[PDB]
A paper describes a structure:
Transcription activator-like (TAL) effectors specifically bind to double stranded (ds) DNA through a central domain of tandem repeats. Each TAL effector (TALE) repeat comprises 33–35 amino acids and recognizes one specific DNA base through a highly variable residue at a fixed position in the repeat. The crystal structures of TAL effector (TALE) proteins bound to their respective target DNAs have revealed that the residue at position 13 is the only one directly involved in DNA base recognition, whereas the 12th residue stabilizes the proper loop conformation. dHax3, an engineered TALE protein, proved to be a useful scaffold for structural characterizations. We then present fifteen crystal structures of engineered dHax3 variants in complex with target DNA molecules, which elucidate the structural basis for the recognition of bases adenine (A) and guanine (G) by reported or uncharacterized TALE codes.
The structural observation suggests that Ile34 may not be a major contributor to the affinity of DNA binding by TALE repeats, consistent with the classification of NI as a “weak” TALE code. It also insinuates that base A may “tolerate” a wide range of amino acids at position 34 of a TALE repeat when there is no steric clash. To test this speculation, we generated dHax3 variants with the 34th residue on repeat 7 substituted with different amino acids. In total, we obtained nine high-quality structures that elucidate the accommodation of base A by Leu, Met, Cys, Pro, Trp, His, Thr, Asn, and Glu at the 34th position. Among these, the hydrophobic residues Leu, Met, Cys, and Pro all adopt conformations that do not clash with base A. As what happens to Ile34, there is no specific coordination found between these hydrophobic residues and base A. Trp, Thr, and His, in spite of the presence of polar groups, do not form H-bond with base A. They also appear to adopt conformations that simply avoid steric clash. These residues may all represent weak code, if they are used for base recognition.
Author numbering: 231 to 723
The structure:
Amino acid sequence: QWSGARALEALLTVAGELRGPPLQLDTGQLLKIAKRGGVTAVEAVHAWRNALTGAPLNLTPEQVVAIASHDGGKQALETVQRLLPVLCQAHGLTPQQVVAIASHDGGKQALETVQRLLPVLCQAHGLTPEQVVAIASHDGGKQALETVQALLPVLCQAHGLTPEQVVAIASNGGGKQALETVQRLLPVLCQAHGLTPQQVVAIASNGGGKQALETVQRLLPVLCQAHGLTPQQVVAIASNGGGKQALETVQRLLPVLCQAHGLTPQQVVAIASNTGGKQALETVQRLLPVLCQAHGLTPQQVVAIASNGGGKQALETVQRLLPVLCQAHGLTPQQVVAIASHDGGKQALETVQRLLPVLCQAHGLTPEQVVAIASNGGGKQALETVQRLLPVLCQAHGLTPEQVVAIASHDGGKQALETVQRLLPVLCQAHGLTPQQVVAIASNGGGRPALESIVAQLSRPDPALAALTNDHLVALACLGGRPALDAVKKLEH
DNA sequence: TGTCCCTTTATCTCTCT
DNA sequence: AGAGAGATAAAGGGACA
């Protein structure tokens, strides 16, 4: 019989009990732990079920699942219960930060290393705990933290990096690799190719940073004489997750895309300069003719869909859904292109297909409003949130649907919608802001932290902002959100 | 196999004017 | 508003006990 049979059965037995108290895990959650944490993780969750959710730690199920669904999740679980008290009291971290550290492959290692190295990294190297956390909050955090301790001096002193830059580089998967690669390649990339430290840091500061730097060093000469590319364009291709793949694919497919489809190199760089550029390019080479056939979509329109993270996913999904969205849902081809020309355009298209008739019929929105909500990064999130929150926001909070749509129609709109519903009463009732003012603050990218900034200043006032009126603070918050308020604080000082 | 670490891709959010 | 950066997650491979 098949070997994995016993283990699979074990998985399913134990899994069925976790649908019960104190955890109440759904199928989605249970499957997730099985795939990544394995069977030992699922058994550990059950084993530790009461101990985790109850006092002391008082973790939510989500947090328990977040910790459990990685390699070694059994180990992270045992360690969290051991070290969350220690790190919260002896180092002053919040439980959320502890969970974040725990929620990665080898979580036990990161947590233990943070427990061992946080004092030395703050006292002798002047890092903040938040910086120590960020370094530790990726696979191999243990490696990254140790490598930061070893190399912060020689990176700041012998190579001229600020600690901020070193932290930025370190704070990715394989962080240890990017650090070590920057020690070796920084002089070479700067002195031989005239790259700034800043540019090298941008290349280094992604997952697989080491891979992109070495590939930059290799392909920069070939790309800058044989293809008409500037260093700046190369840097932009490489300064993304999997920049190595993106670069090799730009050498491969630039001439092909140009000659065969009439694209400019500028258009090719744009496609390559997003996470998964390789995937986007190869998908363009294969789908552009298909999309453009019979006076269909223009090239320009295809290039735009391609020119976002996961543009491959966006492209393929357009090709599948362009017919059904236009025919059965009444959307113009131009509208479909707009929904898809953002990160996660695939997700947004699928969510418009699913939710457009519902939001129109059940909530009284127009397809134009639905398109506008969808036409941002995380559009799926904004659309799903409008569906959930329109009734409470309108009925209980006084908002017009037109205002709810305005809040949802920016990157992170789901975050803004949730924050308005959460902070509108205290902001209006307890401090005399008008709803229109709250909506105005929230109808911008970064709507959430802008609203949180305001509530903070009105509930635990910084003197540094006391000269500003509520209306001025509002005017500021609409202008530049949280950053603007924070900048204004620094100025007073 | 369980655990740790690294790399690529996709998606979501906030910044920076 | 569009480009850049950072965050969070899913999934696969190498490594080794």
